[PDB]
Structures are given as structure tokens and as C-alpha cells.
Amino acid sequence: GPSRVVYLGSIPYDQTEEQILDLCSNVGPVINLKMMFDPQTGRSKGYAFIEFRDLESSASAVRNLNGYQLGSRFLKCGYSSNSDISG
């Protein structure tokens, strides 16, 4: 059914968690954010899970961030679940 959680993919590898939190906060209030990193190098894997406070905000993220041009990359954004953001 509906979800507060989205995935955000194709993120430039140099984007920080702070930057992605700013991008998402613009869309709406964020209550959790998990950026994926390589366990050894710490290098970004170029995707994240974001949980918004409400359903309107996650829907807005899917609408506004899917295909959003961030530097040279085109973001992908769709619905995810509690399982994804919890690991």
C-alpha cells in the first residue's frame, strides 16, 4: 500500500548525506535517511533510502526527484519500504 519510504538512486558518488538531506528536506520533512556506502572504502554506493514524515512528502519525492538532474546524473526515485531503510 502507501509508503513514507522512498529509494533515491543514481546519486552522484560525491554527494554527501548532508546534501541529500537538504535535497529531500526541500521536498518535505525527513524522519530517517540511510545512505549506502562501501563497508571497506566508505565510498558512496550512489543510492539512499529516505523516510518522510508523511505520505504527501514521499509522493512528492517520487514526483519531483525521479528524473531530477543532479550534476551530470539523472536521479531515480520510487517507493520503498520499512524493510529497506531498516536493513
From Swiss-Prot:
Q: Which residues cross the membrane?
A: none
Q: Where in the cell is it found?
A: Nucleus
**Top-level taxon of the source organism:** Eukaryota
* RRM domain mapped to chain residues: 4-82
Q: What does this protein do?
A: RNA-binding component of the cleavage factor IA (CFIA) complex, which is involved in the endonucleolytic cleavage during polyadenylation-dependent pre-mRNA 3'-end formation and cooperates with the cleavage factor NAB4/CFIB and the cleavage and polyadenylation factor (CPF) complex. Binds to A-rich RNA sequence elements.
Q: How does it assemble?
A: Component of the CFIA complex, which is composed of RNA14, RNA15, PCF11 and CLP1. Interacts directly with RNA14. Interacts with polyadenylate-binding protein PAB1.
Extra facts: Present with 6350 molecules/cell in log phase SD medium.
Q: What is this protein called?
A: mRNA 3'-end-processing protein RNA15
The uppermost taxa in this organism's lineage are: Eukaryota, Fungi, Dikarya, Ascomycota, Saccharomycotina
The gene that this protein is the product of is RNA15
Give the residues of the full protein shown.
16 to 101 of 296
